[PDB]
Amino acid sequence: GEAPNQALLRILKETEFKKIKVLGSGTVYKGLWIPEGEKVKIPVAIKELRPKANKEILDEAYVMASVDNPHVCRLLGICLTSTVQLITQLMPFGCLLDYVREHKDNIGSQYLLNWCVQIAKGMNYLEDRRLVHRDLAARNVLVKTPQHVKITDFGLAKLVPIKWMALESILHRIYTHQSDVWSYGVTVWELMTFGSKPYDGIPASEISSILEKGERLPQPPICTIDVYMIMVKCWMIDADSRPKFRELIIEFSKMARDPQRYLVIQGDDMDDVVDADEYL
Numbered sequence: 430g431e432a433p434n435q436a437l438l439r440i441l442k443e444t445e446f447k448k449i450k451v452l453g454s455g456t457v458y459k460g461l462w463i464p465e466g467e468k469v470k471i472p473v474a475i476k477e478l479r480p481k482a483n484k485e486i487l488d489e490a491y492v493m494a495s496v497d498n499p500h501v502c503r504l505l506g507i508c509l510t511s512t513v514q515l516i517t518q519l520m521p522f523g524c525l526l527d528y529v530r531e532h533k534d535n536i537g538s539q540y541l542l543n544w545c546v547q548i549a550k551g552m553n554y555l556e557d558r559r560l561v562h563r564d565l566a567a568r569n570v571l572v573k574t575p576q577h578v579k580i581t582d583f584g585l586a587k588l589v590p591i592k593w594m595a596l597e598s599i600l601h602r603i604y605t606h607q608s609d610v611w612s613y614g615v616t617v618w619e620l621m622t623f624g625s626k627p628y629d630g631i632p633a634s635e636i637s638s639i640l641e642k643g644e645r646l647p648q649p650p651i652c653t654i655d656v657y658m659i660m661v662k663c664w665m666i667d668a669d670s671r672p673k674f675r676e677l678i679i680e681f682s683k684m685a686r687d688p689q690r691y692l693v694i695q696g697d698d699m700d701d702v703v704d705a706d707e708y709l
């Protein structure tokens with residue numbers, strides 16, 4: 430009744446790509462990928478490890494290779510040199526959490542609402558593929574262009590960050606697609622607050638209890654009650670009361686159609702290069 434995962438895992442020669450710049454510390458690189466004998470150049474992020482966490486990175490690669498959706502990060506390949514190197518599409522504008530901090534005084538309602546739509550789209554795809562993220566958060570969304578974000582970090586993904594977790598996750602390490610909706614709510618509240626830290630200062634030992642008291646994250650200043658309503662439904666203790674990712678797509682799309690009705694915001698060589706999203 431479960432279908433066979435016929436995703437392909439592509440092994441790359443170290444020959445086939447070049448590092449260019451360090452993006453962070455294993456270690457991730459901006460780099461270019463020339464497929465073998467194809468006359469295309471593909472901007473990539475390359476993660477070469479530096480151990481028995483070799484099991485952890487293969488799980489990520491397994492997951493990343495089995496997804497294909499415009500709002501989830503796909504594996505381009507792996508390279509089994511003396512360390513494991515994973516190759517994936519370069520997300521030029523970094524991670525949405527940093528981006529919303531760096532650009533807050535020029536992010537408008539249309540962008541925020543569209544990010545909410547794209548993230549719900551990605552998350553709904555993971556649901557389709559009977560996949561649970563378990564670590565949805567603003568830090569784990571990357572920005573290809575400002576008009577185009579993708580869900581990432583598939584370490585935790587299955588077929589810790591207490592301040593992002595459904596209550597049933599905090600209590601009984603339970604995890605659903607509805608557990609992910611709760612984290613979707615926190616993520617939106619991150620965006621809606623231009624990168625504020627949830628429950629700032631509250632020690633995470635208390636988080637489980639305050640939520641039992643019925644407390645939740647406050648309504649961000651830019652948020653109409655319509656938007657905040659939606660965030661609050663993602664945080665029902667009754668997980669079947671929370672909204673479905675397909676419904677969040679619909680709701681935020683409705684609003685994206687008239688964004689200023691729903692968010693009130695003061696002031697509304699490189700020759701053969703092909704973007705990964707066009708390399709099939």
Ligand SMILES: CC(C)(C)Cn1c(N)nc2ccc(-c3[nH]c(C(C)(C)C)nc3-c3ccc(F)cc3)nc21
Pocket residue numbers: 452453457474475476504505506514515516517518519520521522523524571582
């Ligand atoms: C993080 C950044 C936004 C500042 C840099 N960055 C940009 N700009 N695009 C990116 C795309 C991917 C990654 C990336 N991050 C990680 C950590 C978080 C495990 C360290 N692993 C990978 C990676 C996963 C699979 C793979 F095949 C190749 C790389 N980083 C990217």
